[PDB]
């Protein structure tokens, strides 16, 4: 299903996806909390600057040759916290190896002091 | 890197972990919301009954031969929501296993005050 995606949290999740897929650092910045935690493949990054300095460019490169097709996306808001869970079909190739698999993402978003929703935890698989 | 683990929500997380690792279905069932979502290996289950009918018993069988060592665990509470993020070392064998494992849990405080897991993401 596609549930809750029309919301402010939804808007942030959608721009984040596009921005990472397009290599737009201005929007990736706007979407992630300064102290974002990112979980993927047994490794954890503990802040936005850490992700940016260590993995963002690689992640952008990896996505450039893939078509990501959303299969489902649910967002549930409980006051100042929103949970986004989505599954997408990634098809293409990276560094000559074909990719054809279901990707999964759990995001936690918190409403910041000024009302802006920002992503504070990312779990990719 | 171990933060918030002794909270009320943390105790449900602890019981859930222990119950899977020990094969206690009653406890796993009391820990999960009826409409829990489970994400793992590209597949999704959408209710306790679905998970419990099959994937639960497979998970318990997989864990019977593994040693699960917590490496880090953070639980953050925001009113009636708690978020649990952990990383653990899984070492043993099934069907050599030596892997880091990751888990995101979302828990929601119910009308009776008990916390229940509403979303699981394992990798």
Coordinates of N, CA and C in Angstrom, one line a residue:
Chain A
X1 N 0.9 -1.2 0.0 CA 0.0 0.0 0.0 C 0.9 1.2 0.0
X2 N 0.2 2.4 -0.3 CA 0.8 3.7 -0.2 C 0.0 4.5 0.8
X3 N 0.5 4.7 2.0 CA -0.3 5.2 3.1 C 0.5 6.3 3.8
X4 N -0.1 7.4 4.0 CA 0.5 8.6 4.7 C 1.5 9.3 4.0
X5 N 1.7 9.1 2.7 CA 2.8 9.7 1.9 C 2.6 11.2 1.6
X6 N 1.3 11.6 1.6 CA 0.9 13.0 1.3 C 1.3 14.0 2.3
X7 N 1.8 13.6 3.5 CA 2.1 14.4 4.7 C 3.4 15.2 4.5
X8 N 3.6 16.1 5.5 CA 4.9 16.8 5.5 C 6.0 15.8 5.6
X9 N 5.9 14.8 6.5 CA 7.0 13.8 6.6 C 7.2 13.1 5.3
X10 N 6.1 12.7 4.7 CA 6.1 12.2 3.4 C 6.9 13.0 2.3
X11 N 6.6 14.3 2.4 CA 7.3 15.2 1.4 C 8.8 15.2 1.6
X12 N 9.3 15.1 2.8 CA 10.7 15.0 3.2 C 11.3 13.7 2.7
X13 N 10.6 12.6 3.0 CA 11.0 11.3 2.5 C 11.2 11.3 1.0
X14 N 10.2 11.8 0.3 CA 10.2 11.8 -1.2 C 11.3 12.6 -1.8
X15 N 11.5 13.8 -1.2 CA 12.6 14.6 -1.7 C 14.0 14.0 -1.4
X16 N 14.1 13.3 -0.3 CA 15.3 12.6 0.1 C 15.7 11.5 -0.9
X17 N 14.7 10.6 -1.2 CA 14.9 9.6 -2.3 C 15.3 10.2 -3.6
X18 N 14.6 11.2 -4.1 CA 15.0 11.9 -5.4 C 16.3 12.5 -5.3
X19 N 16.6 13.2 -4.2 CA 17.8 13.9 -4.1 C 19.0 12.9 -4.1
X20 N 18.9 11.8 -3.3 CA 20.0 10.9 -3.3 C 20.2 10.2 -4.7
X21 N 19.1 9.9 -5.4 CA 19.1 9.4 -6.7 C 19.6 10.4 -7.7
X22 N 19.4 11.7 -7.5 CA 19.9 12.6 -8.4 C 21.3 13.2 -8.1
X23 N 21.8 12.9 -6.9 CA 23.1 13.5 -6.5 C 22.9 15.0 -6.0
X24 N 21.7 15.3 -5.5 CA 21.5 16.7 -5.1 C 21.8 16.8 -3.5
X25 N 23.1 17.3 -3.3 CA 23.5 17.4 -1.9 C 22.8 18.5 -1.1
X26 N 22.3 19.5 -1.7 CA 21.6 20.6 -1.0 C 20.3 20.0 -0.4
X27 N 19.6 19.1 -1.1 CA 18.4 18.5 -0.6 C 18.7 17.4 0.4
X28 N 19.7 16.6 0.1 CA 20.0 15.5 1.1 C 20.3 16.2 2.4
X29 N 21.1 17.3 2.4 CA 21.4 18.0 3.6 C 20.2 18.5 4.4
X30 N 19.2 19.1 3.7 CA 18.0 19.6 4.2 C 17.1 18.5 5.0
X31 N 17.2 17.3 4.4 CA 16.4 16.1 4.8 C 16.9 15.4 6.0
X32 N 18.2 15.3 6.2 CA 18.8 14.6 7.3 C 19.2 15.5 8.5
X33 N 18.9 14.9 9.7 CA 19.3 15.6 10.9 C 20.8 15.6 11.1
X34 N 21.3 16.7 11.7 CA 22.8 16.8 11.9 C 23.3 15.6 12.5
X35 N 22.5 15.0 13.5 CA 23.0 13.8 14.1 C 22.3 12.5 13.7
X36 N 22.0 12.5 12.4 CA 21.4 11.2 11.8 C 22.3 10.0 12.0
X37 N 21.6 8.9 12.3 CA 22.2 7.5 12.4 C 21.8 6.7 11.2
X38 N 22.8 6.1 10.5 CA 22.5 5.4 9.2 C 23.1 4.0 9.4
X39 N 22.2 3.0 9.2 CA 22.5 1.6 9.3 C 22.4 0.9 7.9
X40 N 23.5 0.3 7.5 CA 23.5 -0.5 6.3 C 24.7 -1.5 6.2
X41 N 24.3 -2.8 6.0 CA 25.3 -3.9 5.8 C 26.3 -4.1 6.9
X42 N 25.8 -4.0 8.1 CA 26.6 -4.2 9.3 C 27.4 -2.9 9.7
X43 N 27.3 -1.8 9.0 CA 28.1 -0.6 9.3 C 27.2 0.5 9.7
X44 N 27.6 1.4 10.6 CA 26.8 2.5 11.1 C 27.6 3.8 10.9
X45 N 26.9 4.8 10.4 CA 27.5 6.2 10.4 C 26.7 7.0 11.4
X46 N 27.3 7.9 12.2 CA 26.7 8.5 13.4 C 26.3 9.9 13.3
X47 N 26.6 10.6 12.2 CA 26.2 12.0 11.9 C 26.1 12.3 10.5
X48 N 25.4 13.4 10.1 CA 25.3 13.8 8.7 C 26.7 14.0 8.1
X49 N 27.6 14.7 8.8 CA 28.9 15.0 8.3 C 29.7 13.7 8.0
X50 N 29.6 12.7 9.0 CA 30.2 11.4 8.8 C 29.6 10.7 7.5
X51 N 28.3 10.7 7.4 CA 27.8 10.0 6.2 C 28.3 10.8 4.9
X52 N 28.2 12.1 5.0 CA 28.7 12.9 3.8 C 30.1 12.7 3.4
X53 N 31.0 12.6 4.4 CA 32.4 12.5 4.2 C 32.8 11.0 3.8
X54 N 32.0 10.1 4.3 CA 32.4 8.7 4.1 C 31.6 7.9 3.1
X55 N 30.3 8.0 3.0 CA 29.5 7.1 2.2 C 28.5 7.7 1.2
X56 N 28.2 9.0 1.3 CA 27.1 9.6 0.5 C 27.5 9.6 -1.0
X57 N 28.7 9.9 -1.3 CA 29.2 9.9 -2.7 C 29.2 8.5 -3.3
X58 N 29.6 7.5 -2.6 CA 29.5 6.2 -3.0 C 28.0 5.8 -3.3
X59 N 27.2 6.1 -2.3 CA 25.7 5.8 -2.4 C 25.1 6.4 -3.7
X60 N 25.5 7.7 -3.9 CA 25.0 8.4 -5.1 C 25.5 7.7 -6.4
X61 N 26.7 7.3 -6.4 CA 27.3 6.6 -7.6 C 26.6 5.3 -7.8
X62 N 26.4 4.6 -6.8 CA 25.6 3.3 -6.8 C 24.2 3.4 -7.4
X63 N 23.5 4.4 -7.0 CA 22.2 4.7 -7.5 C 22.0 5.2 -8.9
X64 N 23.1 5.8 -9.4 CA 23.0 6.5 -10.7 C 22.6 5.5 -11.9
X65 N 23.0 4.3 -11.9 CA 22.6 3.3 -12.9 C 21.5 2.4 -12.6
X66 N 20.7 2.7 -11.6 CA 19.6 1.8 -11.2 C 18.3 2.5 -11.4
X67 N 17.3 1.8 -11.7 CA 15.9 2.4 -11.7 C 15.3 1.8 -10.4
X68 N 14.8 2.7 -9.6 CA 14.2 2.3 -8.4 C 12.7 2.5 -8.5
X69 N 12.0 1.4 -8.4 CA 10.5 1.4 -8.5 C 9.8 1.2 -7.2
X70 N 9.1 2.2 -6.7 CA 8.5 2.0 -5.4 C 7.4 0.9 -5.5
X71 N 7.4 0.0 -4.5 CA 6.4 -1.1 -4.5 C 5.4 -0.9 -3.4
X72 N 5.8 -0.4 -2.3 CA 5.0 0.1 -1.2 C 5.7 1.1 -0.3
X73 N 4.9 1.9 0.4 CA 5.4 2.9 1.3 C 4.3 3.3 2.3
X74 N 4.6 3.2 3.5 CA 3.8 3.5 4.6 C 4.4 4.5 5.5
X75 N 3.7 5.6 5.8 CA 4.2 6.5 6.9 C 3.1 6.7 8.0
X76 N 3.5 6.5 9.3 CA 2.6 6.7 10.4 C 3.2 7.7 11.3
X77 N 2.4 8.7 11.7 CA 2.8 9.9 12.5 C 2.2 9.8 13.9
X78 N 3.0 9.9 14.9 CA 2.6 9.9 16.3 C 3.2 11.1 16.9
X79 N 2.5 12.3 16.8 CA 3.0 13.5 17.4 C 4.2 14.0 16.6
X80 N 5.3 14.2 17.4 CA 6.6 14.7 16.8 C 7.5 13.6 16.1
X81 N 7.0 12.4 16.0 CA 7.8 11.3 15.4 C 7.0 10.6 14.3
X82 N 7.6 10.4 13.2 CA 7.0 9.7 12.0 C 8.0 8.5 11.7
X83 N 7.3 7.4 11.3 CA 8.0 6.2 10.8 C 7.6 6.0 9.4
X84 N 8.6 5.9 8.5 CA 8.4 5.6 7.1 C 9.1 4.2 6.8
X85 N 8.3 3.4 6.2 CA 8.7 2.0 5.9 C 8.4 1.9 4.4
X86 N 9.4 1.6 3.6 CA 9.1 1.3 2.2 C 10.0 0.2 1.6
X87 N 9.4 -0.4 0.5 CA 10.1 -1.4 -0.3 C 10.1 -0.9 -1.7
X88 N 11.2 -1.1 -2.4 CA 11.4 -0.6 -3.8 C 12.2 -1.7 -4.6
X89 N 11.9 -1.7 -5.8 CA 12.6 -2.7 -6.7 C 13.7 -2.0 -7.4
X90 N 14.9 -2.4 -7.1 CA 16.1 -1.8 -7.7 C 16.5 -2.7 -8.9
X91 N 16.6 -2.1 -10.1 CA 17.0 -2.9 -11.3 C 18.1 -2.0 -12.0
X92 N 19.2 -2.7 -12.4 CA 20.2 -2.1 -13.2 C 21.5 -2.8 -13.1
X93 N 22.6 -2.1 -13.0 CA 24.0 -2.6 -12.8 C 24.8 -1.6 -12.1
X94 N 25.8 -2.1 -11.3 CA 26.8 -1.2 -10.7 C 28.2 -1.8 -10.9
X95 N 29.1 -1.1 -11.5 CA 30.5 -1.6 -11.7 C 30.4 -3.0 -12.4
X96 N 29.6 -3.1 -13.4 CA 29.4 -4.3 -14.3 C 28.6 -5.4 -13.7
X97 N 28.1 -5.3 -12.5 CA 27.4 -6.4 -11.9 C 25.9 -6.0 -11.9
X98 N 25.1 -6.9 -12.3 CA 23.6 -6.7 -12.4 C 23.0 -6.6 -11.0
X99 N 22.0 -5.8 -10.9 CA 21.3 -5.6 -9.6 C 19.8 -5.8 -10.0
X100 N 19.2 -6.7 -9.3 CA 17.7 -6.9 -9.6 C 17.2 -7.4 -8.3
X101 N 16.8 -6.5 -7.4 CA 16.4 -6.9 -6.0 C 15.5 -6.0 -5.3
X102 N 14.9 -6.5 -4.2 CA 14.0 -5.7 -3.5 C 14.8 -5.0 -2.4
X103 N 14.6 -3.7 -2.3 CA 15.4 -2.9 -1.3 C 14.4 -2.5 -0.3
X104 N 14.8 -2.4 1.0 CA 13.9 -2.0 2.1 C 14.5 -0.9 2.9
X105 N 13.7 0.0 3.4 CA 14.1 1.2 4.1 C 13.1 1.5 5.3
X106 N 13.7 1.6 6.5 CA 13.0 2.1 7.6 C 13.7 3.5 7.9
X107 N 12.9 4.5 7.9 CA 13.3 5.9 8.4 C 12.5 6.3 9.6
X108 N 13.2 6.9 10.5 CA 12.6 7.7 11.6 C 12.8 9.1 11.3
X109 N 11.7 9.9 11.5 CA 11.7 11.3 11.3 C 11.2 12.0 12.5
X110 N 11.8 13.1 12.9 CA 11.4 13.9 14.1 C 11.2 15.3 13.6
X111 N 10.1 15.9 14.1 CA 9.8 17.2 13.9 C 10.7 18.1 14.8
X112 N 11.5 18.9 14.1 CA 12.5 19.8 14.7 C 11.9 21.0 15.4
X113 N 12.6 21.7 16.1 CA 12.1 22.8 17.0 C 11.2 23.8 16.2
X114 N 11.6 24.0 14.9 CA 10.9 24.9 13.9 C 9.8 24.2 13.1
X115 N 9.5 23.0 13.4 CA 8.4 22.2 12.7 C 8.9 21.4 11.5
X116 N 10.1 21.6 11.0 CA 10.6 20.9 9.9 C 10.9 19.4 10.3
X117 N 10.4 18.5 9.4 CA 10.7 17.1 9.7 C 12.0 16.8 9.1
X118 N 12.8 16.1 10.0 CA 14.2 15.6 9.5 C 14.4 14.2 9.9
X119 N 15.1 13.5 9.1 CA 15.4 12.0 9.2 C 16.5 11.9 10.3
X120 N 16.2 11.0 11.3 CA 17.2 10.8 12.4 C 17.7 9.4 12.5
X121 N 17.1 8.5 11.8 CA 17.6 7.1 11.7 C 17.2 6.6 10.3
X122 N 18.1 5.9 9.7 CA 18.0 5.2 8.4 C 18.4 3.8 8.6
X123 N 17.6 2.8 8.1 CA 18.0 1.4 8.1 C 17.7 0.9 6.7
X124 N 18.8 0.6 6.0 CA 18.7 0.1 4.6 C 19.1 -1.3 4.5
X125 N 18.4 -2.0 3.6 CA 18.8 -3.4 3.4 C 18.2 -3.9 2.0
Chain B
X1 N 26.6 4.1 23.5 CA 26.4 2.9 22.6 C 25.5 1.8 23.3
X2 N 25.4 1.7 24.6 CA 24.2 1.2 25.2 C 23.4 2.3 26.0
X3 N 22.4 2.7 25.4 CA 21.5 3.8 25.9 C 20.1 3.4 25.9
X4 N 19.4 3.8 27.1 CA 18.0 3.5 27.2 C 17.5 2.1 27.3
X5 N 18.4 1.1 27.5 CA 18.1 -0.3 27.4 C 17.3 -0.8 28.7
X6 N 17.4 -0.1 29.8 CA 16.7 -0.5 31.0 C 15.3 0.2 31.2
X7 N 14.8 0.8 30.1 CA 13.5 1.4 30.1 C 12.4 0.3 30.0
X8 N 11.2 0.7 30.2 CA 10.0 -0.1 30.1 C 10.0 -0.7 28.7
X9 N 10.3 0.1 27.7 CA 10.3 -0.3 26.3 C 11.4 -1.3 26.1
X10 N 12.6 -1.0 26.7 CA 13.8 -1.8 26.7 C 13.5 -3.2 27.2
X11 N 12.7 -3.3 28.3 CA 12.4 -4.6 28.8 C 11.6 -5.4 27.9
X12 N 10.7 -4.8 27.1 CA 9.9 -5.6 26.1 C 10.9 -6.1 25.0
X13 N 11.9 -5.2 24.6 CA 12.9 -5.5 23.6 C 13.7 -6.7 24.1
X14 N 14.1 -6.7 25.4 CA 14.9 -7.8 26.0 C 14.1 -9.1 26.0
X15 N 12.9 -9.1 26.5 CA 12.0 -10.3 26.5 C 11.8 -10.8 25.1
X16 N 11.7 -10.0 24.1 CA 11.4 -10.4 22.7 C 12.6 -11.2 22.2
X17 N 13.8 -10.5 22.4 CA 15.1 -11.1 22.0 C 15.2 -12.5 22.7
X18 N 15.1 -12.5 24.0 CA 15.3 -13.7 24.8 C 14.3 -14.8 24.4
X19 N 13.1 -14.4 24.1 CA 12.0 -15.3 23.8 C 12.2 -16.0 22.4
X20 N 12.7 -15.2 21.4 CA 13.1 -15.8 20.1 C 14.3 -16.8 20.3
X21 N 15.3 -16.3 21.0 CA 16.5 -17.1 21.2 C 16.2 -18.4 22.0
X22 N 15.1 -18.4 22.8 CA 14.8 -19.5 23.7 C 13.6 -20.4 23.2
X23 N 12.9 -19.9 22.2 CA 11.8 -20.6 21.7 C 10.5 -20.4 22.5
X24 N 10.3 -19.2 23.1 CA 9.1 -19.0 23.9 C 8.0 -18.2 23.0
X25 N 7.1 -19.0 22.5 CA 6.1 -18.4 21.6 C 5.1 -17.5 22.3
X26 N 4.8 -17.8 23.6 CA 3.9 -17.0 24.3 C 4.4 -15.6 24.5
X27 N 5.7 -15.5 24.8 CA 6.3 -14.2 25.1 C 6.4 -13.5 23.8
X28 N 6.9 -14.1 22.7 CA 7.0 -13.4 21.4 C 5.6 -12.8 21.1
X29 N 4.6 -13.6 21.2 CA 3.2 -13.2 20.9 C 2.7 -12.0 21.8
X30 N 3.2 -11.9 23.0 CA 2.8 -10.8 23.9 C 3.6 -9.5 23.6
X31 N 4.7 -9.7 22.9 CA 5.6 -8.6 22.6 C 5.3 -7.8 21.4
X32 N 4.6 -8.5 20.4 CA 4.3 -7.9 19.2 C 2.8 -7.5 19.1
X33 N 2.6 -6.3 18.5 CA 1.2 -5.9 18.2 C 0.6 -6.8 17.2
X34 N -0.8 -6.9 17.2 CA -1.6 -7.8 16.3 C -1.3 -7.5 14.9
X35 N -1.0 -6.2 14.6 CA -0.8 -5.8 13.2 C 0.6 -5.4 13.0
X36 N 1.6 -6.1 13.6 CA 3.0 -5.8 13.5 C 3.4 -6.0 12.0
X37 N 4.4 -5.2 11.6 CA 5.0 -5.3 10.3 C 6.4 -5.8 10.5
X38 N 6.8 -6.8 9.8 CA 8.2 -7.4 9.8 C 8.8 -7.3 8.4
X39 N 9.9 -6.6 8.4 CA 10.8 -6.5 7.2 C 12.1 -7.3 7.3
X40 N 12.3 -8.2 6.4 CA 13.5 -9.0 6.4 C 13.8 -9.7 5.0
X41 N 15.0 -9.6 4.5 CA 15.4 -10.3 3.3 C 14.5 -10.0 2.1
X42 N 14.1 -8.7 2.0 CA 13.2 -8.3 0.9 C 11.8 -8.7 1.0
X43 N 11.4 -9.4 2.1 CA 10.0 -9.8 2.3 C 9.3 -9.1 3.5
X44 N 8.0 -9.0 3.5 CA 7.2 -8.3 4.5 C 6.1 -9.2 5.0
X45 N 6.0 -9.3 6.3 CA 4.8 -9.8 6.9 C 4.0 -8.7 7.6
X46 N 2.7 -8.9 7.7 CA 1.8 -7.7 8.0 C 0.9 -8.0 9.2
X47 N 1.2 -9.0 9.9 CA 0.4 -9.2 11.1 C 1.1 -10.3 12.0
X48 N 0.7 -10.3 13.3 CA 1.2 -11.2 14.3 C 0.9 -12.6 13.8
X49 N -0.4 -12.9 13.5 CA -0.8 -14.2 13.1 C 0.0 -14.8 11.9
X50 N 0.2 -14.0 10.9 CA 1.0 -14.4 9.8 C 2.4 -14.7 10.2
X51 N 3.1 -13.8 10.9 CA 4.5 -14.0 11.4 C 4.5 -15.3 12.2
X52 N 3.6 -15.4 13.2 CA 3.6 -16.5 14.2 C 3.4 -17.9 13.5
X53 N 2.6 -17.9 12.5 CA 2.2 -19.2 11.9 C 3.4 -19.9 11.3
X54 N 4.4 -19.2 10.9 CA 5.5 -19.8 10.2 C 6.9 -19.1 10.4
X55 N 7.1 -17.9 10.0 CA 8.4 -17.2 10.1 C 9.0 -17.2 11.5
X56 N 8.1 -17.0 12.5 CA 8.6 -17.1 13.9 C 9.3 -18.4 14.2
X57 N 8.7 -19.5 13.9 CA 9.3 -20.9 14.2 C 10.6 -21.1 13.4
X58 N 10.7 -20.6 12.2 CA 11.9 -20.6 11.4 C 13.0 -19.8 12.0
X59 N 12.6 -18.6 12.5 CA 13.5 -17.7 13.2 C 14.1 -18.4 14.5
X60 N 13.2 -19.0 15.2 CA 13.6 -19.7 16.5 C 14.6 -20.8 16.1
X61 N 14.3 -21.5 15.0 CA 15.1 -22.7 14.6 C 16.5 -22.2 14.2
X62 N 16.5 -21.1 13.4 CA 17.8 -20.5 13.0 C 18.6 -20.1 14.2
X63 N 18.0 -19.4 15.2 CA 18.7 -18.9 16.4 C 19.2 -20.0 17.4
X64 N 18.6 -21.2 17.3 CA 18.9 -22.3 18.3 C 20.4 -22.6 18.2
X65 N 21.0 -22.5 17.0 CA 22.4 -22.8 16.8 C 23.4 -21.6 16.7
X66 N 22.9 -20.4 17.0 CA 23.7 -19.2 17.0 C 23.9 -18.6 18.4
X67 N 25.1 -18.0 18.5 CA 25.4 -17.1 19.7 C 25.3 -15.6 19.3
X68 N 24.4 -14.9 19.9 CA 24.0 -13.5 19.6 C 24.6 -12.6 20.7
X69 N 25.7 -11.8 20.3 CA 26.4 -10.9 21.1 C 26.0 -9.4 20.8
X70 N 25.3 -8.8 21.7 CA 25.0 -7.3 21.4 C 26.3 -6.4 21.4
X71 N 26.4 -5.6 20.3 CA 27.5 -4.7 20.2 C 27.2 -3.3 20.5
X72 N 25.9 -2.9 20.1 CA 25.4 -1.6 20.5 C 23.9 -1.6 20.5
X73 N 23.3 -0.8 21.3 CA 21.8 -0.7 21.5 C 21.4 0.6 22.0
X74 N 20.6 1.3 21.3 CA 20.0 2.6 21.6 C 18.5 2.6 21.5
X75 N 17.8 2.9 22.6 CA 16.4 3.1 22.6 C 16.1 4.5 22.9
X76 N 15.2 5.1 22.1 CA 14.8 6.5 22.3 C 13.3 6.6 22.4
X77 N 12.8 7.3 23.4 CA 11.4 7.3 23.7 C 10.9 8.8 23.5
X78 N 9.8 8.9 22.8 CA 9.2 10.1 22.4 C 7.7 10.0 22.7
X79 N 7.2 10.3 23.9 CA 5.9 10.1 24.3 C 5.5 8.6 24.3
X80 N 4.6 8.3 23.4 CA 4.1 6.9 23.3 C 4.8 6.0 22.3
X81 N 5.9 6.5 21.7 CA 6.7 5.8 20.7 C 8.1 5.6 21.3
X82 N 8.6 4.4 21.1 CA 10.0 4.1 21.4 C 10.7 3.5 20.1
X83 N 11.9 3.9 19.9 CA 12.6 3.4 18.7 C 13.8 2.6 19.3
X84 N 14.0 1.4 18.9 CA 15.2 0.6 19.3 C 16.1 0.3 18.1
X85 N 17.4 0.6 18.2 CA 18.3 0.4 17.1 C 19.4 -0.4 17.7
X86 N 19.7 -1.6 17.2 CA 20.8 -2.4 17.7 C 21.6 -3.1 16.6
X87 N 22.8 -3.4 17.0 CA 23.7 -4.1 16.2 C 24.3 -5.2 17.0
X88 N 24.3 -6.5 16.5 CA 24.8 -7.6 17.2 C 25.6 -8.5 16.3
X89 N 26.5 -9.3 17.0 CA 27.3 -10.3 16.3 C 26.6 -11.6 16.4
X90 N 26.4 -12.3 15.2 CA 25.8 -13.6 15.1 C 26.9 -14.5 14.6
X91 N 27.2 -15.5 15.5 CA 28.2 -16.5 15.1 C 27.8 -17.9 15.5
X92 N 28.0 -18.8 14.6 CA 27.5 -20.2 14.7 C 27.4 -20.9 13.4
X93 N 26.4 -21.7 13.2 CA 26.1 -22.3 11.9 C 24.6 -22.7 11.8
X94 N 24.2 -22.9 10.5 CA 22.9 -23.3 10.2 C 23.0 -23.9 8.8
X95 N 22.2 -25.0 8.6 CA 22.2 -25.7 7.3 C 23.7 -25.9 6.8
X96 N 28.9 -22.2 8.1 CA 29.4 -21.0 8.9 C 28.6 -19.8 8.9
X97 N 28.1 -19.3 10.0 CA 27.5 -18.0 10.1 C 28.5 -17.1 11.0
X98 N 29.0 -16.0 10.4 CA 29.7 -15.1 11.2 C 29.4 -13.8 10.6
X99 N 28.4 -13.1 11.2 CA 27.9 -11.8 10.6 C 27.4 -10.9 11.7
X100 N 27.6 -9.6 11.3 CA 27.0 -8.5 12.1 C 25.5 -8.6 11.7
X101 N 24.7 -8.3 12.6 CA 23.2 -8.3 12.4 C 22.8 -6.9 12.9
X102 N 21.7 -6.4 12.3 CA 21.1 -5.1 12.6 C 19.6 -5.3 12.8
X103 N 19.1 -4.4 13.7 CA 17.7 -4.4 14.0 C 17.2 -3.0 14.3
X104 N 16.1 -2.6 13.7 CA 15.3 -1.5 14.0 C 14.0 -2.0 14.5
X105 N 13.6 -1.7 15.7 CA 12.2 -1.9 16.3 C 11.5 -0.5 16.6
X106 N 10.2 -0.5 16.3 CA 9.4 0.6 16.7 C 8.4 -0.1 17.7
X107 N 8.2 0.6 18.9 CA 7.3 0.1 19.9 C 6.3 1.2 20.2
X108 N 5.0 0.9 20.5 CA 4.0 1.9 20.8 C 3.3 1.5 22.1
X109 N 3.3 2.4 23.0 CA 2.6 2.2 24.3 C 1.1 2.1 24.1
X110 N 0.6 1.0 24.5 CA -0.9 0.6 24.4 C -1.7 1.3 25.5
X111 N -3.0 1.2 25.4 CA -4.0 1.8 26.4 C -3.8 1.3 27.8
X112 N -3.3 0.1 28.0 CA -3.0 -0.5 29.3 C -1.6 -0.2 29.8
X113 N -0.8 0.5 29.0 CA 0.5 1.0 29.4 C 1.7 0.1 29.0
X114 N 1.3 -1.1 28.5 CA 2.3 -2.0 28.0 C 2.8 -1.6 26.6
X115 N 4.1 -1.8 26.4 CA 4.7 -1.5 25.1 C 4.6 -2.7 24.2
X116 N 4.3 -2.5 22.9 CA 4.2 -3.5 21.9 C 4.9 -3.1 20.6
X117 N 5.7 -4.0 20.1 CA 6.4 -3.8 18.8 C 5.5 -3.8 17.6
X118 N 5.5 -2.7 16.9 CA 4.6 -2.5 15.7 C 5.4 -2.6 14.4
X119 N 6.7 -2.5 14.4 CA 7.5 -2.6 13.2 C 8.9 -3.2 13.6
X120 N 9.3 -4.1 12.8 CA 10.6 -4.8 12.8 C 11.3 -4.7 11.5
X121 N 12.6 -4.3 11.5 CA 13.4 -4.3 10.3 C 14.7 -5.0 10.7
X122 N 14.9 -6.2 10.2 CA 16.1 -7.0 10.4 C 17.0 -7.1 9.2
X123 N 18.3 -7.0 9.4 CA 19.3 -7.2 8.3 C 20.6 -7.7 8.9

